[PDB]
Design a binder for this molecule. Structure first.
Ligand SMILES: Nc1ncnc2c1ncn2[C@@H]1O[C@H](COP(=O)(O)OP(=O)(O)O)[C@@H](O)[C@H]1O
Ligand SMILES: Nc1ncnc2c1ncn2[C@@H]1O[C@H](COP(=O)(O)OP(=O)(O)O)[C@@H](O)[C@H]1O
Ligand SMILES: Nc1ncnc2c1ncn2[C@@H]1O[C@H](COP(=O)(O)OP(=O)(O)O)[C@@H](O)[C@H]1O
Lengths: 683, 571, 114
């Protein structure tokens, strides 16, 4: 077979290092290419373009791929996935002169000395290699300025050294059409989502980047991508990035916006919109608040309201260089079921709320243009914003900066004129400023504010009640080896009930098996579900089981199972009996596998229908702590000379895990007030 | 090559198509023949412009093959093979058999009706969930019968301005008649006719009525075919005889049905030898054609992304040879199966076998009371048509939990070739007030359609406990709905219920014409536990007689959990 | 950086929400433009939205400005209480006009509660 060309052709992948001068390869590639830790390289891409960078190693990069930030990627006129060639460039030398100008639409709004505020800091002893025609970004004064290299003395490339003179002759050049602003949405402006982006990326990869493929092929690419998640999750941002990032044409449609046109004038717009997206395909049509246009279920009513949906349905089926449609809503239920009908919005992606790491990520993205004082601890900020979503975090940053602007600059008073760069550049947001902004809180998101972390409680502990791994071996094959069940015909354990009195670590045991086995977790509660109105409660149960299957293998842990299903003799209502029957239909639903772990006081509490084989077939009892078990629970909750933990343990005979955790928490609070553990146990 | 079959590709077809197709097969060809060849994820049509030994000959290893670079244009009367056909439909069979004979005469022998005075079916209604192939079915019957086809889509009609919408319905019907024999397929019908309780609009109503009028206006015949998810959705008016008087329920495929469907959607692609479609078919229980097609499409795109994609030979003018070499692997289907979405309320396996406890040991011999009861009604339906005697209408099954009551009803259905429709009491009662009664009437109606059949209610006592425990406006309405459906009956369809005892069930259910018969079935002895252990451990020191002797008061599920746990511990 | 764009005022009637908004404007040399729900919602269909736009459009001409929508819920109640191929067409219109913002002009609205 005809083999491929030279080995120095790499795919352009994403960057790990946000610096404009570096690109990363893998060590084995650096060898095969004979390149070293800091070697300056010559990068060739499209439209006969080039760039000069510094090459570092990256153990997470693959031999074939090359990591490079959006600045270089643009200087080269390539998109992710594209291929460029790399060649060493040791002949490069120290620069003499350098002429650079700012791109007009990146300095509007400011006045001052950019050289001092931007160039000077940016280059300063970094020895950045630059090729003429390069466009680079510099962040500061709460914004980013774009600069083009108009000419370098040692032409066409050179290194900017402490001696290199830098001219900046006062006239801002106008941007050229094919020169995308870096101030545009990119995958690098999205944090938290990863798996979702991975999916969406591969979904649009071919149709939007390799259209001819479909002219020559007969297979059907996904046609509509539906985005689920609460407000401010970044659905719009995500869609806009994929478009930019893929050179795709973008066209935004907004429900409220469409739904405010006069009857008929509204549909004419939907059509005119679709019609235009096709003119410029490959293109992405993003319908914003979709449910603002298609709710039909039970909430639709209007010889226009209906006439519109239908119009959207028609327009959808009318599709098939491809153009993809992306819509956004808070959840399935909102949307007209018709929009799902295969050839329409046949693909779905649920953008949840970030995890701890996700927020840290998002925080960084929204503070990249501002000067943060050394006391700023974003990890802390990330750690305390549990149920926040990107829109929240962004607002948090915006407020902390405006607060900073009001104390500092503001009181000195140098506003309302034509804001000076140097001023905005010196000002720094302090941890104190983020503290002020955190002061008020508003998002009551129904979920924890911490990503997949650790656990620790009672692993190896003392004598009596040894480790019995019945629950471990049950979810061993299904959760860790999902492909085994695909090739086999045997049925694994569908659901595992957990009989035990209150505070027996039933909820802690299910959450520990999920985190340890890399399975996704989705905690349902019986008191929370029953508190909802008649039949929105059943809508929450179907939305919980559907979300667990999306991130399978998973573990849907029902907390107080008996409050939802007590059929036996205590059940008495048209809504209570409808909720237990909805849980029996969802349990029979199943068969990557997703197990369902319930918990209750005893077998008598739960309904007899829940036991019926295919649902909860397995069972596991778990009781009270002995003497030695109370020693283990006290050490866990007091981890963060006269203190005898063995003595306090011996006196706590019939204590449980929460009793010892309340004895250590009260003992530490009494120490802060002023022996401490004595005061708490005496109350 | 026929031009509209090679657009999109570039490359050497001869190598990619002709060469493989003929290669040592000695295919006989007559001049003017048009033949199809599949590959590179598509099918190319070729016409035989001339053969040396004219007008027919065999293509042998020596036969020279010219392919002079210009693609001829298709001729009107030369239907593309890339068209929907009965061969592009899988799963449905009995439904197609029905529809086929329904349109056979009117669409193929119109004059018959010019000379005759009998009325052919006028409207055919198609029931089934989305992606079942209703549209595909209708489009095929049309093509397959040379019939003229005209598609109408609800959403599409219902988006026109008021009045502009009806003008279209008429213009549509009016055109189907111009080209009759023709088939008019209304797609999402319920998008136009829901009237029941959900209709509301001096336009919404004005449309339905318009459809009704247009329907009655019918009578070379043109047939109307519509599609919806179920009766309930549609306006009852559409049923009124002379309109949609014929109905066909396209269920979800069975195991075999999926295997079939899978094949159809992978005929144009190169599958690696490791691809096991039977496996794929076996694990996609409640899927429907639209699902399976999506599954294939995704497995191929996934394959395209790893292979071709990374080598990178895209965005240009895709070369046949490339697309032709690429092969989807079982690994690719594995990736595509990775996510799942259809929560279809049904099993994912066609009429298969059973096996559990046939001939087994001493004690509790085989008593064929239930066998002889459903012997005459299920196997010999024509006997009851010519006779006046009444067979057993319903057979109750008293017994404690895990007594194989559900396994006994499912075994009598599969063995006697009867259709099965498993209703559950916990599943029906979980539904909202009165959609639960709509599910009970839809279950009994589906069993009569595929009669002889056996509607097996699972936990009968949860639906009907009248005696003294019943207390609700919805619970009493559900038990009365089950008594009206039981009295409904009289090919016969028996109804087999199951409960703990007579005290649990309602006294109204016993009343002769409903559940007249009864059959008690208890616990396993020593020898019975040996039979249940061997059945669940079928798939030298292991003494099955020793484990059986120690399990005194065990049941069938206790021995099946002892063998399943013993095998998991060995792993 | 982005400054707050819409300020919503909660409280029962006669709490001084309008007075508060009018003061902040005067007190800050800002241009003020009052919009009143009942007032907008009494115009003929279409004539009503034309006014919302004409209002927003004017506040921008004289920015920095403050647009105070008085009885807001008289225009945007949608939750479960919205019903009308005009009633809905208006809210949507307000939503559009809102997103259309971004010398800044701030929007202040008043209602009894979320
Ligand atoms: N994952 C995220 N990464 C970065 N910013 C985010 C993210 N999620 C939300 N944001 C921020 O919040 C804003 C959300 O706006 P948008 O995506 O249009 O949400 P919505 O349409 O629901 O109001 C974004 O403009 C962005 O500034
Ligand atoms: N029985 C079947 N055999 C082959 N393909 C099927 C079958 N059922 C569904 N499909 C596939 O799924 C698609 C279903 O489309 P269609 O029949 O128009 O369904 P619907 O109108 O409900 O969305 C078909 O185009 C076909 O590709
Ligand atoms: N906090 C307050 N301070 C001074 N006057 C107030 C205050 N609250 C209410 N008022 C008086 O009551 C009137 C309230 O009118 P307005 O603010 O327009 O309330 P609303 O629009 O709800 O009827 C004001 O005009 C003012 O005279």
């Amino acid at each position: 077979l005809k083999q491929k060309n030279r080995p120095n052709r790499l795919i352009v992948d994403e960057a790990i290092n946000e610096d404009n001068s570096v690109v990363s390869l893998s060590q084995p590639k650096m060898d095969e290419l004979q390149l070293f830790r800091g070697d300056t390289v010559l990068l060739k891409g499209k439209k006969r373009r080039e760039a000069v960078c510094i090459v570092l190693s990256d153990d997470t990069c693959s031999d074939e791929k090359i990591r490079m930030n959006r600045v270089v990627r643009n200087n080269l006129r390539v998109r992710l996935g594209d291929v460029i060639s790399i060649q060493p460039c040791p002949d490069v030398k120290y620069g003499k002169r350098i002429h650079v100008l700012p791109i007009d639409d990146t300095v509007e709004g400011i006045t001052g000395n950019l050289f001092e505020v931007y160039l000077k800091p940016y280059f300063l002893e970094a020895y950045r290699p630059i090729r003429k025609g390069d466009i680079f970004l510099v962040r500061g004064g709460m914004r980013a300025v774009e600069f083009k290299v108009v000419e370098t003395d040692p032409s066409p490339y050179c290194i900017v050294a402490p001696d290199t003179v830098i001219h900046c002759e006062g006239e801002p050049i106008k941007r050229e059409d094919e020169e995308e602003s870096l101030n545009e949405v990119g995958y690098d402006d999205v944090g938290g989502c990863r798996k979702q982006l991975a999916q969406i990326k591969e979904m649009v990869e071919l149709p939007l980047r390799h259209p001819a493929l479909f002219k020559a092929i007969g297979v059907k690419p996904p046609r509509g991508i539906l985005l689920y998640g609460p407000p401010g999750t970044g659905k719009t941002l995500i869609a806009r990035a994929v478009a930019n990032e893929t050179g795709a044409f973008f066209f935004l449609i907004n429900g409220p916006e469409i739904m405010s046109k006069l009857a008929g004038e509204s549909e004419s717009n939907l059509r005119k919109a679709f019609e235009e997206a096709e003119k410029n395909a490959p293109a992405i049509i993003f319908i914003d608040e979709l449910d603002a246009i298609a709710p039909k279920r039970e909430k639709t009513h209007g010889e226009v309201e209906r006439r519109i949906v239908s119009q959207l349905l028609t327009l959808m089926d009318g599709l098939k260089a491809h153009v993809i449609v992306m819509a956004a809503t808070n959840r399935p239920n909102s949307i007209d079921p018709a929009l799902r009908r295969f050839g329409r919005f046949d693909r779905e992606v649920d953008i949840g709320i970030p995890d701890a790491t996700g927020r840290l990520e998002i925080l960084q993205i929204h503070t990249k243009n501002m000067k943060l004082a050394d006391d700023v601890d974003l990890e802390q900020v990330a750690n305390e914003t549990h149920g926040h979503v990107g829109a929240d975090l962004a607002a948090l940053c915006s407020e902390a900066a405006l607060q900073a602007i009001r104390k500092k600059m503001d009181l000195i008073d140098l506003e309302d004129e034509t804001i000076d760069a140097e001023v905005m550049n010196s000002l720094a947001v302090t941890m104190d400023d983020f503290r002020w902004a955190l002061s008020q809180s508003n998002p009551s998101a129904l979920r924890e504010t911490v990503v997949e972390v650790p656990q620790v409680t009672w692993e190896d502990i003392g004598g009596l009640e040894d480790v019995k791994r019945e629950l471990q071996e049950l979810v061993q094959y299904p959760v860790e080896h999902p492909d085994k069940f695909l090739k086999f015909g045997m049925t694994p354990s569908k659901g595992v009930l957990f009989y035990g009195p209150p505070g027996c670590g039933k909820t802690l045991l299910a959450k520990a098996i999920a985190n340890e086995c890399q399975a996704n977790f989705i905690s349902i509660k019986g008191p929370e579900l029953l508190t909802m109105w008649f039949g929105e409660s059943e809508a929450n149960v179907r939305e919980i089981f559907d979300k667990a299957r999306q991130a399978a293998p998973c573990v849907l842990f029902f907390d107080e199972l008996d409050s939802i299903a007590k059929a036996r003799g205590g059940n008495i209502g048209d809504g209570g009996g409808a909720a237990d029957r909805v849980i029996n239909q969802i349990l029979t639903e199943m068969d990557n596998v997703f197990i369902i772990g319930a918990t209750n006081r005893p077998d008598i509490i739960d309904p007899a229908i829940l036991r019926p084989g295919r649902l909860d077939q397995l069972i596991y009892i778990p009781l009270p702590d002995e003497k030695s078990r109370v020693a283990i629970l006290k050490a866990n909750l007091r981890k963060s000379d006269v203190d005898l933990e063995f003595l306090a343990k011996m006196t706590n005979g019939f204590s449980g895990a929460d009793l010892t955790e309340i004895c250590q928490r009260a003992c530490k609070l009494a120490i802060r007030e002023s022996p401490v553990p004595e005061i708490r146990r005496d109350h």
